[PDB]
Amino acid sequence: ATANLHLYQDLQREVGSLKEINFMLSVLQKEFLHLSKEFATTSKDLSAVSQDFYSCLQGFRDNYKGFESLLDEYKNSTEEMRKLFSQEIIADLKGSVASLREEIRFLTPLAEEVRRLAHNQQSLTAAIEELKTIRDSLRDEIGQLSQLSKTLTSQIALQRKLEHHHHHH
């Protein structure tokens, strides 16, 4: 089994990446709020998908809180708490992080590409379809991450309460 210090270092790397992903998704969220309002009277379908990006990216930081919390538990940890450093779940997280980074890569140019097309009286049909496809992929990835994170939050919270309870004596 992988040493807990190495799993801590793996988690440190992935939580650092999650914080970058969170920041980049906050920028993209705001960009799609703008796009949604800009296009509300010009392209109802573009406006609706743009509002969907705004909505599905709400509270993204909360969707990895269990990982961030786990990382924060290592420094002065008990042996029991360190059982929550699961090599399978940290390896699974690495896949989520990579997939989210790639979704960002594909999404990054698309709002200003829509604006460019619209300013030139060009069709938005293909762009709208691409946006709906990325929205669906991103919802799937965020759901998978959120479930892993929420499980960890529950486990850490209970173990922390238990360890604090022992300080009655």
Numbering used by the authors: 86 to 254
Give passages from the manuscript.
In this paper, we describe the molecular architecture of the prototypical bacterial SNARE-like protein IncA, which mediates the homotypic fusion of chlamydial inclusions. IncA is a protein of 273 amino acids composed of a short, cytoplasmic N-terminal moiety (residues 1–34), a bilobed transmembrane domain (residues 35–84), and a long cytoplasmic C-terminal domain that ends in a tail with low complexity (residues 247–273). We demonstrate that IncA folds into a stable, non-canonical four-helix bundle that is maintained as a monomer by intramolecular interactions. Cells infected with an IncA-deficient strain of C. trachomatis similarly displayed multiple inclusions at a high multiplicity of infection, further establishing that IncA is required for the homotypic fusion of inclusions.
To better understand the mechanism of IncA-mediated membrane fusion, we generated high-quality crystals of a chymotryptic fragment of IncA spanning residues 87–246 (IncA87–246) and determined a crystal structure of IncA87–246 to an Rwork/free of 14.1/16.8% at 1.12 Å resolution. The electron density for IncA87–246, including the six N-terminal histidines of the affinity tag, is exceptionally clear, consistent with the low B-factor of the crystal structure (~10.8 Å2). We found that IncA87–246 adopts an asymmetric and slightly blocky conformation, somewhat similar to a four-helix bundle. Both in crystal and in solution, IncA87–246 exists as a monomer, as previously observed for the full-length cytosolic domain of IncA (ΔTMD-IncA - Supplementary Fig. 1a), that sediments at equilibrium as a single species of 23.9 ± 0.8 kDa8. The tertiary structure of IncA87–246 consists of four down-up-down-up antiparallel α-helices, named HA-HD. However, IncA87–246 deviates from canonical four-helix bundles in at least three aspects. First, the helix HB is interrupted at position 144 by a glycine that generates two shorter helices, named HB’ and HB”. Third, while helices HA and HC run parallel to each other making an acute angle of ~ 10° and bonding throughout their entire length, the longest helix HD makes a 40° angle from helix HC pointing away from the Hclamp and gives an asymmetric appearance to the helical bundle. The hinge and the amino acids preceding Hclamp were found to have significantly higher than average B-factors (~ 26 Å2 vs. ~ 16 Å2), possibly underscoring intrinsic flexibility. Our simulations showed that the structure of IncA87–246 is highly stable and is unlikely to be a metastable intermediate.
